[PDB]
Amino acid sequence: GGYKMSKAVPFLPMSPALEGYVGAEEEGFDPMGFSLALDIRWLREAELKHGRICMLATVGWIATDLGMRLPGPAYQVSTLEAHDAMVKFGPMAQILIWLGIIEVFSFLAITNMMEGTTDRQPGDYGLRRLYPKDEEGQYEMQLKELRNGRLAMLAFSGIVTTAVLTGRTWPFXXXXX
Amino acid sequence: AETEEGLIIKPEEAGKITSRDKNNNPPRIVVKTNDWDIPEYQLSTGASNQVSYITPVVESEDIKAWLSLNVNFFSIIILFTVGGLIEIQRFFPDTLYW
Amino acid sequence: ARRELAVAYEDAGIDLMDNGKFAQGLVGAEAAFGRYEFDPIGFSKYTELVPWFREAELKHGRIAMLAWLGLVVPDFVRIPGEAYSFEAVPRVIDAHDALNADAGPNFQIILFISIVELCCAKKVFEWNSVETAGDYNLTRLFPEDDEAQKQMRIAELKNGRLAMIAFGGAVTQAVITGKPFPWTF
Amino acid sequence: KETSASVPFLPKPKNLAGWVGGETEFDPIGFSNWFDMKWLREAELKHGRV
Amino acid sequence: FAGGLTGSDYGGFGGKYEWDPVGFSTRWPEHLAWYREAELKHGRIAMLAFAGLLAPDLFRLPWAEFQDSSLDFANAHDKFVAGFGPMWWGFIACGGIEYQRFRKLGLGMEGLTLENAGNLGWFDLPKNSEERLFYETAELKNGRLAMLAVSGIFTAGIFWDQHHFPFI
Amino acid sequence: KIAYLQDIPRTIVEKDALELILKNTPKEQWENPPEDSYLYTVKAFAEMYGPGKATKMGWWDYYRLKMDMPDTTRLSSERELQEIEEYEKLMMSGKVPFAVPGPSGYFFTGFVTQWKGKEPFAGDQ
Numbered sequence: 001g002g003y004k005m006s007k008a009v010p011f012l013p014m015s016p017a018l019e020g021y022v023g024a025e026e027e028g029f030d031p032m033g034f035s036l037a038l039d040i041r042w043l044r045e046a047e048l049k050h051g052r053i054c055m056l057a058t059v060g061w062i063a064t065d066l067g068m069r070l071p072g073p074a075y076q077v078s079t080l081e082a083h084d085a086m087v088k089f090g091p092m093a094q095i096l097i098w099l100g101i102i103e104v105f106s107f108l109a110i111t112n113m114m115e116g117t118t119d120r121q122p123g124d125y126g127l128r129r130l131y132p133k134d135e136e137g138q139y140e141m142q143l144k145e146l147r148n149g150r151l152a153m154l155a156f157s158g159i160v161t162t163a164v165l166t167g168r169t170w171p172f173x174x175x176x177x
Numbered sequence: 178a179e180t181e182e183g184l185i186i187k188p189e190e191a192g193k194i195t196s197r198d199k200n201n202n203p204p205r206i207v208v209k210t211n212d213w214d215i216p217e218y219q220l221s222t223g224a225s226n227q228v229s230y231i232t233p234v235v236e237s238e239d240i241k242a243w244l245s246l247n248v249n250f251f252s253i254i255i256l257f258t259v260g261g262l263i264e265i266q267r268f269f270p271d272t273l274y275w
Numbered sequence: 276a277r278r279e280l281a282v283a284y285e286d287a288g289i290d291l292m293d294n295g296k297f298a299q300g301l302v303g304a305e306a307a308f309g310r311y312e313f314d315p316i317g318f319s320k321y322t323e324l325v326p327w328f329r330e331a332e333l334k335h336g337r338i339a340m341l342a343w344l345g346l347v348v349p350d351f352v353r354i355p356g357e358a359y360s361f362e363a364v365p366r367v368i369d370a371h372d373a374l375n376a377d378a379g380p381n382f383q384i385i386l387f388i389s390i391v392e393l394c395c396a397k398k399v400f401e402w403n404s405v406e407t408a409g410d411y412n413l414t415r416l417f418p419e420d421d422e423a424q425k426q427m428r429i430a431e432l433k434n435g436r437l438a439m440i441a442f443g444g445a446v447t448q449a450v451i452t453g454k455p456f457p458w459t460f
Numbered sequence: 461k462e463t464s465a466s467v468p469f470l471p472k473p474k475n476l477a478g479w480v481g482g483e484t485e486f487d488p489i490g491f492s493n494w495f496d497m498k499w500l501r502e503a504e505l506k507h508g509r510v
Numbered sequence: 511f512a513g514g515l516t517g518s519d520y521g522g523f524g525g526k527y528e529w530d531p532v533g534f535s536t537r538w539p540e541h542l543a544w545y546r547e548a549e550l551k552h553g554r555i556a557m558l559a560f561a562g563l564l565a566p567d568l569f570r571l572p573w574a575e576f577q578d579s580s581l582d583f584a585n586a587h588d589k590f591v592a593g594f595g596p597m598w599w600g601f602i603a604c605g606g607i608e609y610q611r612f613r614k615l616g617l618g619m620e621g622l623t624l625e626n627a628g629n630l631g632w633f634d635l636p637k638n639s640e641e642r643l644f645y646e647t648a649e650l651k652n653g654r655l656a657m658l659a660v661s662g663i664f665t666a667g668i669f670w671d672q673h674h675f676p677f678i
Numbered sequence: 679k680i681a682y683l684q685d686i687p688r689t690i691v692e693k694d695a696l697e698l699i700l701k702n703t704p705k706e707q708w709e710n711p712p713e714d715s716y717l718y719t720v721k722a723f724a725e726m727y728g729p730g731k732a733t734k735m736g737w738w739d740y741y742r743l744k745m746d747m748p749d750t751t752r753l754s755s756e757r758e759l760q761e762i763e764e765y766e767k768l769m770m771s772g773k774v775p776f777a778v779p780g781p782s783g784y785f786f787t788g789f790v791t792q793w794k795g796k797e798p799f800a801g802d803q
């Protein structure tokens with residue numbers, strides 16, 4: 001009967017920037033009010049980019065720890081030293097160049113979306129594969145992407161911290177604490 | 178534009194207008210200050226979840242206009258020229274070819 | 276009469292008027308034999324901060340109520356493990372010094388308490404009125420009638436005030452004695 | 461507001477009418493809007509032949 | 511200044527002093543009864559405290575637990591309170607007297623005003639009405655002095671390790 | 679009397695602080711405080727918040743208001759105002775409170791040496 005109360009934090013009203021967006025109006029989690037201080041479109045873009053980066057990085061860490069390697073003796077290093085070894089090897093610089101060109105295109109997308117020159121949704125790059133045709137299907141698919149991205153972000157955080165703390169491959173089950 | 182729904186009211190009706198908003202935020206008092214950098218300071222009447230962005234408003238057009246200023250143009254060109262000279266010196270030191 | 280934060284929040288903010296009551300008509304003053312409006316230093320005369328002060332009083336009482344129960348239970352049971360055994364940390368008070376910093380236990384408690392506080396901080400400053408001060412929607416056993424709601428509100432405050440004072444003795448008596456739960460010499 | 465066929469997340473480049481790649485209009489940076497695109501076509505053709 | 515309290519007046523080369531250079535009276539006028547009551551009770555105890563430290567050095571009470579040497583003013587407290595001891599005998603006595611003050615002024619000390627403060631009613635020596643004014647100022651002037659005196663006694667005696675009347 | 683100085687809530691500014699402001703501010707400026715004068719902010723807010731007006735503020739707006747009002751200690755008291763009103767009177771009357779330079783500064787000697795000579799416009803008299 002009063003404020004549109006946030007579902008996540010029941011004692012804090014939902015921020016108006018969370019209306020009509022993916023995720024958002026199912027949980028409305030924003031107690032610190034970051035959406036009240038920054039554009040919701042930019043926050044959503046950053047969230048989706050972080051989710052995708054983490055979903056790739058978590059699986060990369062899993063594959064590297066479990067023993068999957070490229071057929072080169074230069075890659076016979078642990079996942080912890082993989083970054084430094086490959087930075088000194090060269091491929092990290094090339095990966096950075098390629099991610100740089102892709103991020104130049106992403107920056108153009110953001111600039112042309114925030115200025116309204118295009119009609120782009122925050123995280124949309126045009127890729128429409130396995131995307132439901134029905135609008136509710138699209139909304140719930142975007143929901144699934146967001147949930148998986150957030151889960152992978154937290155999971156990769158834990159994986160990196162535990163791997164550094166205990167020299168051990170991904171499952172960390174044995175360990176000692 | 179950014180206050181499409183604020184129920185913005187004038188000082189003369191500080192305690193008269195009560196219709197809150199499309200949200201439930203109470204009406205906000207608009208004070209017309211004479212500063213050009215802050216032409217209007219908005220004052221609240223109660224607790225509200227108002228979206229006030231702290232980010233600036235920049236656009237590609239005037240950022241490019243700033244980079245088109247003679248300082249930026251003649252600094253980028255001279256920086257590239259100096260860097261090219263330094264790179265040539267690294268790659269062909271001591272002008273042995275001469 | 277416990278308006279839900281959903282609507283109660285519509286009358287929140289720094290009130291610029293005076294109710295005319297002791298502390299803007301807030302619970303905690305009614306004593307046994309009558310009223311015991313206490314404030315002798317006149318902190319409640321700064322009526323703009325009365326919702327804030329009540330929030331601080333409830334927050335302190337809630338921490339102290341757990342904290343006093345904190346110094347009691349380790350003296351009779353401890354978490355199953357060697358780091359918390361009665362031989363590694365004999366008395367309860369030598370726990371902030373033992374389990375802290377690089378150890379991990381206290382540091383994690385600091386972080387997650389920080390996360391909760393940084394999330395529930397907008398309720399302390401915004402959305403905090405003389406009506407919804409300390410109310411975090413967790414009303415399960417709250418009575419429905421107005422007068423009984425006042426008793427439970429009075430019950431929490433008196434218990435919170437008591438624990439605040441009781442915890443002060445608890446650490447002071449324990450530190451000067453190094454003894455189990457009854458901190459008498 | 462149409463989008464380019466090549467990069468669908470970017471606005472369709474104006475001044476790129478049908479010359480060759482009119483089906484996959486590809487100018488993210490926007491040199492055609494900054495320069496005389498006839499000169500750009502001449503440079504591209506000379507580069508391709510060379 | 512501070513109701514009709516006699517802290518000022520008859521106070522030295524000037525007739526009236528009125529020393530309140532923080533405004534603890536004007537800022538909190540409802541507590542002038544409490545402040546006098548506290549100021550007087552502080553003076554009386556301090557005067558008994560100073561006259562205390564000296565007399566044990568000559569006579570000792572017949573309690574036969576206090577009848578022991580080496581109980582100076584730096585160890586008598588922590589020594590007598592036992593596993594109870596003499597210190598509880600004193601504390602219980604102070605409870606008996608302090609309970610009487612409650613009866614005269616009510617439980618919440620509601621009857622405490624700016625004229626009955628520090629007036630337990632023990633009138634044997636005083637006479638007339640102006641002498642009571644003169645004696646009340648003589649009380650405080652002695653009382654305030656001993657409050658600073660015992661303060662210097664306790665600090666100097668235990669810091670410099672004096673423990674006896676010179677306290678030096 | 680002046681409209682906005684009546685029934686002003688204590689929460690906006692305290693009574694003693696407001697009286698100190700009114701004393702420090704010259705009388706002619708009460709009706710229309712100039713600008714950048716604490717009284718200007720008092721007018722610009724007391725005409726918005728009060729008994730018949732908006733009785734509530736956001737916490738941040740009230741916080742900023744409390745940092746625009748005087749904090750009861752940055753205002754000259756009556757004796758200081760007398761010091762200024764009399765020092766300026768001495769200086770304009772042609773008399774100088776005699777002072778003597780010292781270690782990077784001057785000690786006031788508590789003497790009124792009549793400064794202007796018999797020819798008040800003469801520089802060497």
Ligand code: KC1
Pocket residue numbers: 520521522523524526527651
């Ligand atoms: C250095 C510390 C110090 C001591 C130790 C001290 C002591 C006493 N002062 Mg004193 N005093 C200052 C400092 C000290 N005074 C200062 C800085 C000032 C300037 C503001 C000042 C002014 C006055 C005035 C105006 C009066 C006064 C009083 C007394 C008094 C009471 C004696 C008696 O009445 O029993 C005693 C014992 C009254 C008076 O009687 O002086 C004889 C009174 O009228 N004082």
Ligand SMILES: CC1=C(C#C/C(C)=C/C=C/C(C)=C/C=C/C=C(C)/C=C/C=C(C)/C=C/[C@@]23O[C@]2(C)C[C@@H](O)CC3(C)C)C(C)(C)C[C@H](O)C1
Pocket residue numbers: 368371372439440442443444446447450
């Ligand atoms: C972190 C840390 C530690 C710690 C700690 C902590 C948290 C210590 C905390 C200490 C704490 C919390 C101390 C409170 C005191 C409160 C008091 C004294 C209140 C008195 C109040 C009094 C005396 C008066 C009360 C009343 O007047 C009132 C108000 C109204 C009247 O009607 C009734 C009466 C007269 C009764 C260790 C464990 C110690 C060591 C470790 O290594 C480092």
Ligand SMILES: CC1=C(/C=C/C(C)=C/C=C/C(C)=C/C=C/C=C(C)/C=C/C=C(C)/C=C/C2=C(C)CCCC2(C)C)C(C)(C)CCC1
Pocket residue numbers: 259262266
């Ligand atoms: C960072 C910073 C800072 C610092 C700064 C500085 C200190 C700077 C400097 C700078 C510099 C100081 C630089 C330099 C440079 C140099 C150069 C760049 C050189 C060049 C040269 C040339 C170019 C040459 C050429 C030639 C040749 C070789 C041959 C031919 C001829 C000629 C001669 C032409 C500060 C803290 C303040 C602040 C913050 C920021």
